[model samples]
Target: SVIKPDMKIKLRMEGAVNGHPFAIEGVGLGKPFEGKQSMDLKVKEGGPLPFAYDILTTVFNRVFAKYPENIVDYFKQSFPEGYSWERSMNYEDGGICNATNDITLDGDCYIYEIRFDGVNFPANGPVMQKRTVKWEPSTEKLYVRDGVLKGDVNMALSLEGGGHYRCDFKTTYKAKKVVQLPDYHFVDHHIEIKSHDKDYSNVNLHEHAEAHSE
Candidate 1:
């Protein structure tokens, strides 16, 4: 297929976490296009829940380092159905506890919102965490000859402990290539060259030379 204008494209997060926000935008040539798609646009701030921050920051930021390859597999194993409940270790206090994760996908922009809650820690009681992530397409339109490429991205995380962090980056893609063919046809023709070189003066080229030589 020939590359055209206004083709639908999307970028999204692989797994669910807290404080991450997904971004939505467009790509093309000639005229520039840009827009924003909100994932969980809300304005409710919660009180301090220091425990929640400790857990999230350690697991997502420190333990996992917010790396896509690391977290995506973890989520698939822990929350195959977009939800999970199990006992896990707390990196901070070295305390064993029960944690619950619920991941939901919003139809618009394929945004993924995840909620994390835990109970029965060493000292901190119940803790809650939230994050949103989504994919963003490259601002530049993919050309026909270009190979695999990446696009820009935006995400964020919010914690009940009054922690809010955001990230803007880009992700790669295995883009498909295309070419356009002209609608007209070409007619075959003959060519003659005139040369004055002494050694080539008598040389004559014929269209049926191959047949005569055979």
Candidate 2:
């Protein structure tokens, strides 16, 4: 199909998680490079939980000091090494891109989607527990006249202890990444996503209401 303006086109990044979701090879790190954007989610705060200062600061805690509830240990203790998935972005397109408008396409237009999935864990380029990740089908339709060869989005905006941490839900709350953790209840958790790719031309995370770590 030919590309158009205002109307989105989908690459349908097909894969699977534990053979689920319709997308995956072994989902862990779905690399979102090229044009920049993060996928929207369906989470509720305190329900699935949000990434606050505590969650991150305490992550490398074990190496740093080990807070009450850290991310790595929690997952490894809970999930079997049996859990896993992987998804890669295809559809590499024209090489030159224009940053002034919404006209980026292919691998040049990196799209990212983050979720908690009771799942996703933080790793230090090194990891412990892993989850079944699937690049759920999404749409795209903004192609530049050419490429954005990882321009500003190239600087690598580190997401907190941000090492390639990975996320879903099914089991009960046995070993929570946090203490005082409640059951699997929904609260419309503002898993509000705002990916700014790097520390450079920032447009990152949130603070409950503001969600404007812009």
Candidate 3:
């Protein structure tokens, strides 16, 4: 299962560039990262929600001084995986969210290693004109431990399509837990993610948008 809707989660990224320490966070949203069923599905009140993705994206731009909406599209990429009421094959939301489960769990803490390498985005767009291919060869280490979800991200994206847009970003940070999920994400979602902030008592969501270039 992937981050569909009404699920609860957060993503806080932190890292350093040019010797300057950088930290930022982005909460999830109601829309399912522009995936298949997500776009076609009705709008819900949860998913990457109360988590506050808007704030995260705003913070990312303010702190990193880069633009491309990368944080919104890729931050969810750090999520460990989703739980099903039971178990099934998998799922991606927008081309952004694979809607599939891809992670490991130890106790209540979750672990996952992912990255983007020469992958195209907007899975359903005109190539070399609208799609911006990514080549994030760096590894991303993610986890849900302590009282938050943390990850290290590094990316290099270029709109090889036509705009000739290129955005380079890297950072590490932690996303604090807000509330419990209305449903299961995968199989072994051990531990209880108690609520920390009342504001987060809303929303849910992950995330990855692979860009296939050919």
- Cα TM-score of candidate 3: 0.23
| lDDT, residue 196, model 2 | 30
TM-score of each: 0.23, 0.19, 0.23
Show model 1 residue runs off by greater than 4 Å. 1-46, 57-87, 91-94, 108-115, 119-214
Give candidate 3 misplaced runs (Cα > 4 Å).
1-4, 33-214
Q: How many backbone clashes does candidate 2 have?
A: 39
1-214 in candidate 3: lDDT tens per residue? 3433333223343422212233333333222333211001111222222111221221111111111332232333334432211111111111121111123333333332222112222334322123433332333333344434333343333344534322322222332223331111111111111222233322222222222111
Note the Cα lDDT for every prediction shown.
Answer: 0.23, 0.19, 0.26
User: Candidate 1, 40: how far from true, in Å?
Assistant: 9.1
Candidate 2 C-alpha lDDT tens digits along 97-210: 111111123422212122111113233221212121112221111112121111011111123344322211111113222223222111111222234332112223221111
Question: Cα lDDT for residue 54, model 3?
Answer: 20
Higher TM-score: candidate 1 or 2? 1
After aligning candidate 2 to the native by TM-score, how far in Å is the CA of 149 from where it should be? 9.2
